[PDB]
Amino acid sequence: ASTKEKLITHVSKEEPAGPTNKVTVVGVGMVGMAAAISILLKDLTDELALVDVMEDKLKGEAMDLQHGSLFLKTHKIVADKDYSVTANSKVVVVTAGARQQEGESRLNLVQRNVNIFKFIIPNIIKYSPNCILLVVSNPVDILTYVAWKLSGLPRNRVIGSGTNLDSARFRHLMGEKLGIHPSNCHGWVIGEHGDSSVPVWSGVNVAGVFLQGLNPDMGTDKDKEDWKSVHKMVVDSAYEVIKLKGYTSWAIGMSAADLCQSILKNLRKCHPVSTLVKGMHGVNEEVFLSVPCILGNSGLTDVVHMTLKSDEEKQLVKSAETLWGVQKDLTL
Amino acid sequence: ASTKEKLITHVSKEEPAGPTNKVTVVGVGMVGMAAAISILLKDLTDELALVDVMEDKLKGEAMDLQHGSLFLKTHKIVADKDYSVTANSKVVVVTAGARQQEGESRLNLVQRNVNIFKFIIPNIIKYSPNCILLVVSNPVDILTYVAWKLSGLPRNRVIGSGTNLDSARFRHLMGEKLGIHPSNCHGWVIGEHGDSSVPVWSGVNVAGVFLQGLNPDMGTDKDKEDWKSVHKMVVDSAYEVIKLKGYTSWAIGMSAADLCQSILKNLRKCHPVSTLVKGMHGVNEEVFLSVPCILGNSGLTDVVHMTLKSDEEKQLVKSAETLWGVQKDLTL
Amino acid sequence: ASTKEKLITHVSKEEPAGPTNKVTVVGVGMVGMAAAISILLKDLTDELALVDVMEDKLKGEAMDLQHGSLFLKTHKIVADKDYSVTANSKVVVVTAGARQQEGESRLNLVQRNVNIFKFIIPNIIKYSPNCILLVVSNPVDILTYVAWKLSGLPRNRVIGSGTNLDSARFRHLMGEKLGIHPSNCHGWVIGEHGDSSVPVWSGVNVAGVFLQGLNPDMGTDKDKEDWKSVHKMVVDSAYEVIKLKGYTSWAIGMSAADLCQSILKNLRKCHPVSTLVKGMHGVNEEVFLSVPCILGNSGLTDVVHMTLKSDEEKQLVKSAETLWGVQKDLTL
Amino acid sequence: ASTKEKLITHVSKEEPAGPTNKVTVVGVGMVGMAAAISILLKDLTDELALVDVMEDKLKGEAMDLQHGSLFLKTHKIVADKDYSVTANSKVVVVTAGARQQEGESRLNLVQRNVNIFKFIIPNIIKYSPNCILLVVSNPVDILTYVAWKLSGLPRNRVIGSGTNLDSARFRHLMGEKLGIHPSNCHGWVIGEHGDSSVPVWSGVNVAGVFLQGLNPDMGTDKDKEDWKSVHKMVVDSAYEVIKLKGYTSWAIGMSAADLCQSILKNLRKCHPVSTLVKGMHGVNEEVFLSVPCILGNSGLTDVVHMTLKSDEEKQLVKSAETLWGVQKDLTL
């Protein structure tokens, strides 16, 4: 009899229950790992699954993480090239994508990514049919649409990180300017993720007091404080970070973990995420854009309809036309 | 027309998924509420259900907790006299019991408790057939056995709090004695909860260093440092708190929340809990006593076999015999 | 010779550093203990001190909490009738007060409380001259003013719980109404704590969307959705819980712990707390009312100036006048 | 008047208090960042300071981290090439070091590191004289000694990560073998960090039951289970991870954060860390080796004296001679 057989005795004759809040992260590059590390440290999952085509790198990250088990409240951390390791996941974060190339059209980049998703997505759904897909891959808005198409899942179970982090970045800068914690500064950045995103000036407030009211010119050329530059810094953040260190990851990881917390714990919290906006704000095309949504364990179950100005609804309609412009040329 | 309707639009077609880690607490006395506040403050559940026999108190406690929602990460808190409110619980903490009466025999008291359980246990199982029962009511060892028989549940899903807190109290006292945090002081109190519990001196250590190795007289009459007084302080703990403030609640509440976390998060952690021990250390009847067990989302799946001194086993057998003697005279 | 001596050797030459975030709770009634259990379960302090006038109860509560040390991350929990036990506290939560008496005038009740504070306040300051006083006792607005005068402390270090919980209750009710988490529902209840508090309808929003924008009649007689009943439910909350369970405690405890966290962790977060408002919204006397303030380790360092409707300010002035009327008749 | 001057009013006339639990991380390479990220996610500090000679990389990491402020409870995150930014730190984690070279003697590598520390250490002590230095740089044992010499701080305030992580790795593997959480598997790896470390077989236990007792041959050639290979995997872990992904970081980061938690919160917890062992286990040279110690806010205030076998004390004496062999040739 081994030490284990002499020390521990199995007394259950019932089949093991299986994970309750399993999370899978596709792509263990810096973004994937930042999300994984954030999810582990915040004790959100009872089982973390990792997958990536680069086998050695995947095995090393998983191994590195498993060695810290003593400091975590996660039952197990699994990794493998075969997607069967992701079975029964509640949430699957997709960070994988195509490595851009030399002067390659945007339609070709997107199509390259689509081809990558044609493998990934169907393999994810085979082992976790009741999951919720959280797409982080860029371009996020269109790629979320692709994931939604290829998966066959209802809209509530396919979400894009959208402008979740850009709104957090806005609140942070707003916080540094006012001298108060970002969680007390309210502001929303919606629309298309990137340079075309929309800062909704009418909602910027502290304790329910809107700053636009105190400065009606806020966000325009007539602004004596140039708030427009704050949103400009939000869109140029990733670029600035990359110019300084080559990649961007920590902020995105905390944002993804934040989204997973609301999903896993069924919080029903409002987050600006990418979802189907067809029929909203004059948008009639089948595109995904960021708007405030309610997240829980059933996914994106509710969408907030914002009171937007003609100029704002217009920017959204324009972004939607650009996305659809690429989407209608794709082969799914 | 509604303000809600104009602001929020439900976009899901799927029926809501339901709770993933629901917890029910039976009895809203001091012990039950302490457990409830401990489970909520530690973000262990997405839905807490409370049930008791008094409508107003039950409703008052729920309302008080609900008013604190802003500070919690629990989707909802519900309470009712009807057990249907506890549907789909993963863990059900049972604290309900009969108030003691002077001049009463031990048998009457235990039967009174059984009478209560005959109404309660089947109600729980009807709505949560796949739950894990955590019995905290006293006498915990006999009452856990009763819940096991009445529930019809397999042994791995019926657990008694047993000596979990008494071991924690022992580690706390040991800690105060050596000047270090209780999590670094290791010691186990097993067997029958209370006066007849057994402190396993051979396991008492810090960083793996046997304290009995440094003082072989430890725990005996020859013991010059009188460690026996530490174990006597443990068993007398409830009594002392009771005659100072009137009852005990906080330590038990923290203790139950600790057990729930191991179970809800499938930690497979070792806890000294009450479980069936027939066939161990000489016990030959179906009785529940405390021994180190491994707990997860499948319940109590493994038991650790400690190597005990024939003397230590003798106390366990005497206890078993005392417990069996009472069980045969009960009316289920 | 000692077992301790052979096992552990003290190797420091320096005297121990003392606590860095010590918290004291004055009064161990239901409210005080709820605050104590909330502060400990959320790992906010390295040393918790309890003080009250009854030796046995005080000692019983401390012992109960100490028995749960294994499950906590607080170095020590101490309790005594002598205020020297509260030395070097960063935050002192004051909940002590006079039990009400039927047929009693408002003035007698408040004076009775002042009589209590004249003994308590100087004792606290003698041992913790650099603490931040958090007054929770009712009537909080007048009693915070009294603590300020008696303490001799600068305004930034004397805070009243004010409408912090009532605003949380409002966000909770709003949340239940719209079907989303209270942290996503924004609304502020300011002014005099209780019946005369003011709900600032202009600030009520979700994701920055003015609900008053969608329903301008919100809060008035023309209001078809009767939002006024939500604010009336807030003010009637304590009363309802009181006649159901006998007292309130949990929500207040969570509320105080929330305020302590902002202060202990220097978050500079916005909270609706009671502070000196002379010179704001027309108030001309030294009275404390609730308004949004920024809290950190330096205390209440900044106050937010909400743009209120002349009608809203009128209620604040009426309150100020009612409060001043009572303060001039008090004997400090 | 700006929006800020009209919205927020400073009401404090007292000097700001300053950080209470500030932490500085020297070297923002992967190890530094893994530690920083672990410290932030576990809400341990109210101010995180980062420093590194590589200015761009430093600015990018800090920037990346600051953008996630909304998801953290840390007042501020600062970074700079000038050490004045680290003023008033409670704990300073040193990860910086010399980049090894082609067939360079060990004495020269160490001396190169010493030269790096001759700048760093005195700059750290200039701005934070009352801090606690936590050295992670390899070779950790000797480098901790160097830091201690150059700083002039008492031994309780200069600690080396030592075998903290290797013991965690041991407990993890032990856990995977037995099928239980690592926090329930006790085992200690002491001595010199690396291939010469010592696994203390007599302390390996589960619930106080030692495995050596159940298998007296445990750890020797006569072992029928080859436990010696478990310790072999612990020493070869870093290498295996690096062969798979080029670097090692996550496990080390969680371990450092774990150490900082005990220090910052004055937990008085037992950790196997590197400290002055002169006078212990036959060691008479002035060297640092890992042994179980008690950590709190005064630093390493206590050392546990383990009951070790002649063969074990010997390995320690040998390691100490090797370290001293290098140390006596250094120019500090």
Ligand SMILES: OC[C@H]1O[C@H](O[C@H]2O[C@H](CO)[C@@H](O)[C@H](O)[C@H]2O)[C@H](O)[C@@H](O)[C@@H]1O
């Ligand atoms: O497609 C699988 C890979 O996806 C990620 O990496 C890619 O995405 C990175 C960030 O967008 C690019 O820098 C990289 O060039 C792309 O190949 C993931 O990080 C990789 O580990 C996955 O193999």
Ligand SMILES: OC[C@H]1O[C@H](O[C@H]2O[C@H](CO)[C@@H](O)[C@H](O)[C@H]2O)[C@H](O)[C@@H](O)[C@@H]1O
């Ligand atoms: O390596 C740890 C566990 O691996 C298995 O589990 C993974 O792979 C399965 C398919 O082979 C999935 O179904 C499961 O969800 C994954 O976690 C193995 O079966 C377990 O026993 C191992 O502990």
Ligand SMILES: OC[C@H]1O[C@H](O[C@H]2O[C@H](CO)[C@@H](O)[C@H](O)[C@H]2O)[C@H](O)[C@@H](O)[C@@H]1O
């Ligand atoms: O009032 C809160 C919710 O109550 C229901 O849910 C509880 O009671 C049910 C039995 O009546 C249980 O099945 C359920 O699991 C409990 O949570 C009601 O059905 C929900 O709509 C209410 O929100």
Ligand SMILES: OC[C@H]1O[C@H](O[C@H]2O[C@H](CO)[C@@H](O)[C@H](O)[C@H]2O)[C@H](O)[C@@H](O)[C@@H]1O
């Ligand atoms: O039986 C239902 C009640 O059980 C508990 O309360 C009783 O048990 C306590 C512990 O022995 C006694 O002190 C108390 O006097 C008994 O009434 C539970 O605490 C109650 O809330 C339940 O209604």
Ligand SMILES: OC[C@H]1O[C@H](O[C@H]2O[C@H](CO)[C@@H](O)[C@H](O)[C@H]2O)[C@H](O)[C@@H](O)[C@@H]1O
């Ligand atoms: O019994 C616990 C500790 O009590 C002392 O500390 C408390 O009481 C002091 C006044 O008597 C305060 O100054 C101190 O801040 C309190 O924590 C005693 O001095 C400590 O040695 C005891 O461990």
Ligand SMILES: OC[C@H]1O[C@H](O[C@H]2O[C@H](CO)[C@@H](O)[C@H](O)[C@H]2O)[C@H](O)[C@@H](O)[C@@H]1O
């Ligand atoms: O005055 C010292 C006591 O203050 C609180 O208790 C009293 O105040 C409560 C709230 O008004 C009353 O309900 C109670 O009747 C008063 O005695 C505190 O809760 C007590 O523990 C303190 O001793």
Ligand SMILES: OC[C@H]1O[C@H](O[C@H]2O[C@H](CO)[C@@H](O)[C@H](O)[C@H]2O)[C@H](O)[C@@H](O)[C@@H]1O
């Ligand atoms: O000495 C300052 C630098 O220290 C660290 O980097 C060095 O240490 C790494 C791990 O041991 C080596 O891989 C690297 O080659 C050494 O130069 C830190 O990571 C750097 O950012 C600091 O500038």
Ligand SMILES: OC[C@H]1O[C@H](O[C@H]2O[C@H](CO)[C@@H](O)[C@H](O)[C@H]2O)[C@H](O)[C@@H](O)[C@@H]1O
């Ligand atoms: O950039 C944020 C803060 O920087 C200052 O603080 C840092 O630099 C000081 C020396 O210049 C240190 O004393 C201080 O501890 C560091 O945090 C600046 O003084 C603050 O106002 C800024 O908020």
